[PDB]
Design a protein around this ligand. Structure first.
Ligand code: NA
Ligand code: NA
Lengths: 373, 373
DNA sequence: AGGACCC
DNA sequence: GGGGTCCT
DNA sequence: AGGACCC
DNA sequence: GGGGTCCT
């Protein structure tokens, strides 16, 4: 095809941003978002005062006694604002992929190439970068790949400027030749900045990481599997025998993560579009012995229907999740034709409790609607 | 919507038909199709001489010593002829669903309704059935549902007449208001006949069955589960407490098979279209201790590529199946980007053997290509 | 239905 | 924690 | 990846 | 047996 321009948009302390927009009084006072017993995220007034992400409410409070907390267990508003962002990006180029509520990849390739056609011979000398260039590296205006990347940073800026002007949201962007590198670079300067990774700087970025667990793709379990063999650095992953790598994780995994260590990722950006599933979870511990473990289900069921109801699309499969002591457990089933057409509570409750029994004769109850049509 | 006209086409002794077209000399001499140690299917010259489907080659031979056998382990030609049938049906109405190589449901609803508009007031008195009416039941020319069903049998005949005139194939048809009833009725008069089930005759058909295992939907395992509770007849299934039914099979299953016993099925006819997977199996026993259990894999791999190659679409997942002694086992994985683009043997062989090892440190080896794009 | 990844 | 993805 | 159904 | 489907 062959070379691509990918932007990774990533919002600053998203939920905190949403909270500060809601109550202006909270802005420039140090703000944590409290989920249950966890300060899940917090603003830079609290961040730069010692607080880290997922810090104990009591720990985070004995570090910063002035810390103000909002409860962010209902995710509704963050979800709503989450799509307002994607929709905005979809407007620059239709192919946008979400990573959770606060990140988006956008594939700028066909868009960059267009800009480069407005562009005469003389005004091609005057293409300038927007924001940071990774590792402070010299642009070469005759390197065709440097050029279409700078255009990427120009678009990324136009995206951020517009997120702010339209939704009032500040964020970070990384422009690179693939999703992996776009992601790694986007976070080099933050909170409200952007960076572009020129190709000659790829190893520099990849080796700046201190553990493989820092490569998006390698996670808690895969990391500790590699570790157990003596594979600690990115270079250890690079240099390791492809053969030993296979005989512990799959050839599926082994082929893919070795590439990732070279900064090599040719996975496409996927149009996310509407969501595949709507789900919700209440948490507790211990409790539910078992029933009203029901009443918790009813709660979730009413909440869900609302969201499922505004969508327009219909869910053909319900799911019940539990977990237990002391990985969870799920039973699903199709949703009957008559009760799909969309007092809808009473049959749905019957469905999930039968599912429930089929469980148990717990620390989590969660309902999920999926298989949308 | 609400009521439908569905035809179930079902070919007579398909493979035998294909063989007799290939060697005319075999016609009206008693013909079995030999897969391995099984006479898998046979013509009506052999059928009406005692031979049953899946009868031992030696059993089938000591019943009929004159029995002539062709080997039907390579399924290529039957598959080719299989789609020539579907393609033909797709021409009457685009929504055709295959059940294996020899059956097709076609949804005649929108097609019937059209015919009924050419049709004035006076020539509506003269609508006649084509072939058998199930249980010899009186047509009532004023029953709107009798009428659009007769049109169904007219179309079904036009389908059969055309299968024969174009592909030289004889078959059976059943017209009914759903797939279940279409299927059950199609086989009432055979080999080369058709039948239409008028709605007032539905229970009569459903109760003509002697075991639940005869309802398409209920199979070896579900049948023996119902049996174990004392549920032997269709009526036993009809009358059984919905509650006891759930606590042994799933509410998923329980809700659906109770309907089936009432002759109630509202599952749509699905456009099959192109195939989801290409696979192949060699069989043996015992043997492969383990390797050349490889060489068997290479064989299948060459055969597969051919079929996969003619398609145009590309397979993104390979699969290896084994089974063992004395349900099988599978490992799959994606197929690498570079080797997808489509010496292609050598990497593919490497893939499946790694998969193979991941097995074993058997009576079947099978490769499968799927996830087509 | 369970198990990897992202946030 | 409260959520989503896709692959087996 | 295993397990139901159809042929 | 030599094949296909979809749901968990
Ligand atoms: Na990671
Ligand atoms: Na059956």
């Amino acid at each position: 095809a062959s070379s691509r321009v990918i932007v990774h948009v990533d919002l600053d302390c998203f939920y905190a941003q949403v909270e500060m927009i809601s109550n202006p009084e909270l802005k420039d006072k140090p703000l944590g978002v409290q989920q249950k017993y966890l300060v899940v995220t917090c603003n830079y007034e609290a961040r730069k005062l010692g607080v880290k992400k997922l810090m104990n409410v009591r720990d985070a409070k004995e570090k910063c006694p002035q810390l103000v907390l909002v409860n962010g267990e209902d995710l509704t508003r963050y979800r709503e604002m989450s799509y307002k962002v994607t929709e905005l990006l979809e407007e620059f180029s239709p192919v946008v992929e979400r990573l959770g509520f606060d990140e988006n990849f956008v594939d700028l390739t066909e868009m960059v190439e267009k800009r480069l056609q407005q562009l005469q011979s003389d005004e091609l000398s005057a293409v300038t970068v927007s924001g940071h260039v990774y590792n402070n590296q010299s642009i070469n205006l005759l390197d065709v790949l440097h050029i279409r990347l700078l255009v990427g940073s120009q678009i990324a800026a136009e995206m951020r400027e517009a997120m702010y002007n339209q939704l009032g949201l500040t964020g970070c962007a990384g422009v690179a030749s693939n999703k992996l590198l776009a992601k790694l670079v986007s976070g080099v300067f933050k909170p409200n900045q952007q960076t572009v990774l020129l190709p000659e700087s790829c190893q520099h970025l990849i080796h700046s990481l201190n553990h493989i667990k820092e490569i998006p793709g390698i996670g808690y379990k895969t990391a500790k599997c590699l570790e157990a063999l003596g594979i600690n650095s990115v270079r250890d992953l690079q240099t390791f025998s492809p053969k030993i790598l296979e005989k512990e994780l799959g050839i599926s995994v082994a082929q893919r993560i070795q590439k990732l260590s070279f900064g090599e990722d040719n996975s496409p950006v996927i149009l996310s579009g509407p969501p595949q599933s709507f789900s919700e979870e209440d948490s507790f511990k211990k409790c539910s012995s078992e029933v009203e473990a029901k009443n918790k289900i009813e709660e979730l069921l009413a909440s869900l229907l609302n969201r499922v109801c505004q969508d327009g699309r219909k869910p053909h499969t319900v799911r019940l999740i539990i977990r237990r002591y002391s990985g969870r457990e799920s039973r699903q089933c199709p949703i009957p034709s008559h009760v799909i057409q969309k007092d809808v509570m009473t049959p749905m409750v019957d469905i999930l409790m039968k599912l429930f029994r089929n469980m148990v004769n717990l620390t989590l109850l969660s309902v999920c609607f999926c298989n949308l049509k």
